[PDB]
Design goal:
The chain is an all-alpha fold and 84 residues long. Helices cover 38% and strands 0% of the residues. Bound molecules: sodium ion. It comes from Escherichia coli (strain K12).
């Protein structure tokens, strides 16, 4: 039986970051936990609206759930029903 990680398809809002951190991530097309864990710190800090404060918060909230940045995933993005 193949194994997957359901947490990856949770929206970034389930992490309960600060409104600012959440809004900054969405602006970078980072809408799910799977999108976020794939980005790296260097890459994130390079974005217009994110600083050290936010990155510290983000690394902290992710670690609290056994996650991190720079995570390699397999078979992303999550499955969807194809249109007709
Ligand atoms: Na997939």
């Amino acid at each position: 039986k193949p194994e997957f990680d359901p947490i990856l398809l949770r929206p970034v809002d389930d992490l309960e970051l600060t409104v600012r951190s959440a809004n900054c991530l969405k602006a970078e097309a980072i809408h799910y936990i799977g999108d976020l864990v794939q980005r790296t710190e260097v890459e994130l800090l390079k974005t217009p609206n994110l600083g050290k404060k936010s990155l510290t918060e983000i690394k902290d909230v992710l670690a609290s759930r056994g996650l991190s940045l720079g995570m390699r995933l397999e078979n992303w993005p999550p499955a969807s029903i194809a249109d007709e």
